[PDB]
């Protein structure tokens, strides 16, 4: 196999996610668990707002809350930066601009802790409208899909990406979220820097009928393409 970290994703891998957030001074934490099967590009995750009521819409946190689980086709194995940085991991940073509203700034570490792939994230949101689509909770909760456009960032021994999410507004149009992303390896080992390509990602959101806490169940597929 073309990286050593690739070998860690051949079977089902357990996942943990920990997020601390602050959006316009509304603080919150989210804890997630589940598993990923990179063979199929398949993620099954469940998140709990551990601070009680989430002050932003669940759909707006999906992209922040493990692209190492992408399915790369055989012909594209040399373009998988994410697995190549494992097990030491990578830093993933974003700015997410919500059109006509505020932005999220995120910093995460994605790495193995024992046998578990752990995503630890700090999120800060500023300049939101208290009655806009985000803090006013005006988004639909269901499904979204888009493409993550990835390019190499050789100067940082990593990658960049950008993409746009169209979040449906309930009885409305969409709320756009323009994402800009950077990833850099945590370790000193060699990594794979890719040619331009994209991750086709579909995120289906649901509720656990036995869960009384504020929560999100996510079923997601992530597939590399474009080469
Ligand atoms: K909502």
DSSP 80-97: -HHHHTTTT-EEEEEEEE
Integer angstrom CA distances of residue 177 from 36, 40, 96, 102, 110:
25, 27, 6, 10, 22
Distance 199 CA to ligand 1 centre (A): 25
What's the per-residue H, E or C state across 111-137?
Answer: EEECCEEEEEEEEEEECCCCCCCCCCC
Distance 66 CA to ligand 1 centre (A): 23
Distance 57 CA to ligand 1 centre (A): 4
Q: Please, what is the Cα angle at 170 between 164 and 171, to 5 degrees?
A: 115
Distance 191 CA to ligand 1 centre (A): 38
| Resolution of this deposited model, Å | 1.7
Tokens representing 72 are: 């790369």
**Cis amide prior to 222 (ω within 30 degrees):** no
Who surrounds ion ligand 1 at CB < 5 A? 57, 137, 139
Distance 139 CA to ligand 1 centre (A): 5
Question: What are the domain boundaries of the chain?
Answer: 5-225
Instruction: Find the distance separating the first CA and the last CA of the chain, reported in whole Å.
Output: 19
Distance 83 CA to ligand 1 centre (A): 33
Closest alpha carbon to 61 in 33, 114, 15, 20: 20
**C-alpha span between 197 and 224 (Å, rounded):** 7
Tokens representing 125 are: 């949101």
Q: 5-225 has which fold?
A: Green Fluorescent Protein (2.40.155)
């Amino acid at each position: 196999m073309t990286s050593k970290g690739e070998e860690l994703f051949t079977g089902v891998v357990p996942i943990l996610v920990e997020l601390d957030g602050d959006v316009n001074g509304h603080k919150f934490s989210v804890s997630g668990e589940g598993e990923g099967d990179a063979t199929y590009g398949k993620l099954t995750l469940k998140f709990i707002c551990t601070t009680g009521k989430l002050p932003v819409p669940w759909p707006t946190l999906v992209t922040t809350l493990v692209q190492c689980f992408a399915r790369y086709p055989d012909h594209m194995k040399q373009h998988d930066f994410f697995k190549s940085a494992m097990p030491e991991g990578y830093v993933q940073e974003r700015t997410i601009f919500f059109k006509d509203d505020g932005n999220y700034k995120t910093r995460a570490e994605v790495k193995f802790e024992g046998d578990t792939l752990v995503n630890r994230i700090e999120l800060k949101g500023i300049d939101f409208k208290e009655d806009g689509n985000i803090l006013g909770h005006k988004l639909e909760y269901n499904y979204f899909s888009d493409n993550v456009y990835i390019t190499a960032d050789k100067q940082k021994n990593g990658i960049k990406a950008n993409f746009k999410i169209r979040h449906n507004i309930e009885d409305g149009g969409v709320q756009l979220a323009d994402h800009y992303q950077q990833n850099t390896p945590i370790g000193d080992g060699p990594v794979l820097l890719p040619d331009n390509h994209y991750l086709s990602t579909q995120s289906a959101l649901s509720k656990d009928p036995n869960e009384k806490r504020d929560h999100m169940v996510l079923l997601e597929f992530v597939t590399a393409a474009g080469i």
